[PDB]
Amino acid sequence: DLRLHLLLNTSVTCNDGSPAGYYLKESRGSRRWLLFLEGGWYCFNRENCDSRYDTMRRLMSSRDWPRTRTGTGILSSQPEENPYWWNANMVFIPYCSSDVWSGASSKSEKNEYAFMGALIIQEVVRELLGRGLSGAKVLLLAGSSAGGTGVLLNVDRVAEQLEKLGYPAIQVRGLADSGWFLDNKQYRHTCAPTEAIRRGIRYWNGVVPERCRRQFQEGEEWNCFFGYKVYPTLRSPVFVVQWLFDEAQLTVDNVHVQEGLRLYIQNLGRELRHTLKDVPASFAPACLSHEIIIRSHWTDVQVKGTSLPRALHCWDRSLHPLKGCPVHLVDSCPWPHCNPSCPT
Ligand SMILES: O=C(O)CCSc1ncnc2ccccc12
Ligand SMILES: *[C@@H]1O[C@H](CO)[C@@H](O)[C@H](O)[C@H]1NC(C)=O
């Protein structure tokens, strides 16, 4: 089990002003640290945040969090469930800021809610340095869904934070799961993440990585929430995990089979595959699904005969091509479940 620690700096808060926090299981002797960002959509104005507070309150508040959590998948400490990093120090950071991990705004008289996702990450890192992170060799910032996008937005800032604090020997890396989205046309028109993120950035006081911000400039920072645009600006090594037919992508595209829809789905998979062509560390199976890395059966899916835990181990070796140890694994078949190992 991982044990809850509420942040000692109680000014770094969840949406409702309760303290943010993290769950920790230490592994004495290991100098590897895994910090995982939870996902769960977002909210972008008073009315849709009020609805989320009524029926999704654990994503906006720490008042009801349990004292412990069980680590699963890549957060498991059992080698049978986690062949990759079972002996690492494990950290689960709950998503309670509703801002894709981008916000830097406190609650006040002008603000009903606080949006502090980017500051939550920075404060967790600061407080862990006194609990053993100061001796680390590798810090892997991982995350799923909105948390995967959060990795892309924050990995280089964590690297800069550790450098400025005097820890240049900690190698910061990213693992973005199910957070690589396309700003494409909907199958039927119905809002869209581009517009919601444009509004959210203003509502949250949201921040993006510096080099990407300098490319797109004022009013266009929403572009940096899209993996294929922000990834080439990043300096830290980042491994990208993405289903070719991701369920959250299809939801925003208003897809729920005749020729028009068949062509739409085939084109989506081809576009996603194109965006990953020049991403050297990637795992992209041809499945209709959502998230993978903290699921207990994450070991089961394979691309070209290689599992995700194996690909991640090969990535570690590459950062010390390798014979029989590949790191770029993207399916070429064009329809969901053309890969027989897709989740049932
Ligand atoms: O968090 C989750 O469970 C999945 C929904 S997140 C998401 N879905 C669709 N498009 C996006 C575009 C930018 C950032 C986040 C998203
Ligand atoms: C607490 O966090 C806030 C927001 O990040 C920061 O401005 C402040 O300096 C922090 N104070 C301490 C003592 O860590």
Side-chain angles (χ1 to χ4, degrees), residues 1-109 111-217 219-344:
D1 281 358
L2 283 70
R3 184 162 79 266
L4 174 60
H5 302 269
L6 295 176
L7 293 176
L8 300 179
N9 183 346
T10 57
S11 292
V12 179
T13 72
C14 297
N15 288 132
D16 68 355
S18 55
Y22 62 94
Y23 291 81
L24 169 62
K25 185 181 189 299
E26 276 180 61
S27 181
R28 297 296 186 185
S30 178
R31 297 186 186 262
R32 300 176 202 257
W33 287 74
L34 177 60
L35 278 60
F36 176 88
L37 306 178
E38 186 186 22
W41 295 95
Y42 48 76
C43 66
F44 62 89
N45 63 40
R46 172 68 178 271
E47 33 284 341
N48 62 46
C49 293
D50 281 355
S51 176
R52 184 180 172 88
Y53 197 75
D54 246 341
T55 57
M56 303 179 74
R57 189 172 290 182
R58 285 168 290 171
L59 295 175
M60 300 188 71
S61 182
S62 64
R63 63 177 289 257
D64 303 325
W65 288 356
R67 172 195 164 255
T68 59
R69 284 185 66 100
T70 301
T72 57
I74 201 173
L75 287 168
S76 174
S77 293
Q78 289 175 330
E80 297 80 14
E81 183 166 340
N82 180 9
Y84 172 55
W85 265 29
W86 61 269
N87 200 41
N89 296 273
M90 302 298 194
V91 181
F92 177 94
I93 311 178
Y95 182 39
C96 67
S97 53
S98 306
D99 57 3
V100 201
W101 299 93
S102 77
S105 179
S106 301
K107 180 174 165 61
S108 72
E109 43 150 20
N111 301 330
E112 170 82 350
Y113 296 109
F115 300 93
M116 306 188 79
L119 297 173
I120 290 167
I121 293 166
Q122 184 175 7
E123 185 64 28
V124 170
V125 168
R126 277 186 282 243
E127 298 188 18
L128 290 173
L129 284 165
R131 286 179 172 266
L133 183 65
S134 60
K137 179 74 177 205
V138 182
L139 191 174
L140 180 57
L141 185 68
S144 296
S145 307
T149 311
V151 171
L152 300 169
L153 294 170
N154 288 278
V155 65
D156 276 7
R157 189 171 301 109
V158 172
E160 168 190 45
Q161 173 191 12
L162 291 174
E163 290 158 14
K164 290 183 189 242
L165 285 170
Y167 297 100
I170 304 176
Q171 297 184 61
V172 178
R173 309 175 180 168
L175 170 55
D177 168 30
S178 301
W180 185 276
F181 298 106
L182 300 182
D183 54 341
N184 66 342
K185 297 194 168 201
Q186 302 182 302
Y187 172 66
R188 279 195 189 95
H189 299 299
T190 61
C191 284
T194 59
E195 181 60 26
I197 290 159
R198 290 160 181 180
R199 300 177 184 187
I201 287 173
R202 312 174 214 160
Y203 189 57
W204 307 327
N205 193 44
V207 299
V208 301
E210 170 184 72
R211 180 173 293 98
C212 189
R213 178 180 60 247
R214 288 175 175 166
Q215 288 179 4
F216 290 98
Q217 304 186 323
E220 299 280 335
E221 301 94 347
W222 64 267
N223 282 277
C224 299
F225 285 62
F226 290 85
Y228 75 97
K229 302 188 214 197
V230 63
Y231 172 99
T233 77
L234 300 180
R235 300 287 75 87
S236 304
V238 176
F239 193 112
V240 177
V241 175
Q242 186 68 36
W243 306 116
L244 295 181
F245 311 100
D246 182 87
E247 288 165 334
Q249 179 76 50
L250 287 169
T251 292
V252 300
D253 285 330
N254 195 27
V255 171
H256 302 284
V257 177
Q258 297 202 309
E259 181 174 354
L261 183 53
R262 173 173 68 245
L263 295 171
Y264 184 94
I265 292 169
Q266 289 173 332
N267 185 66
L268 170 64
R270 288 194 315 260
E271 289 183 335
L272 209 64
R273 174 173 161 81
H274 179 253
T275 66
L276 299 172
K277 173 197 281 183
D278 299 330
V279 176
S282 54
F283 188 89
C287 311
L288 171 65
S289 191
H290 189 230
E291 300 181 335
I292 192 49
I293 66 172
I294 61 161
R295 298 164 83 168
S296 286
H297 293 88
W298 77 304
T299 53
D300 294 350
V301 62
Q302 300 176 5
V303 173
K304 298 172 164 67
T306 299
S307 73
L308 178 59
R310 176 163 185 77
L312 293 167
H313 157 69
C314 301
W315 184 48
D316 282 13
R317 285 185 56 199
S318 78
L319 295 171
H320 286 351
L322 306 172
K323 186 176 180 178
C325 215
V327 309
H328 181 88
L329 295 159
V330 178
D331 267 330
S332 55
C333 61
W335 194 259
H337 223 318
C338 60
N339 183 326
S341 74
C342 287
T344 67

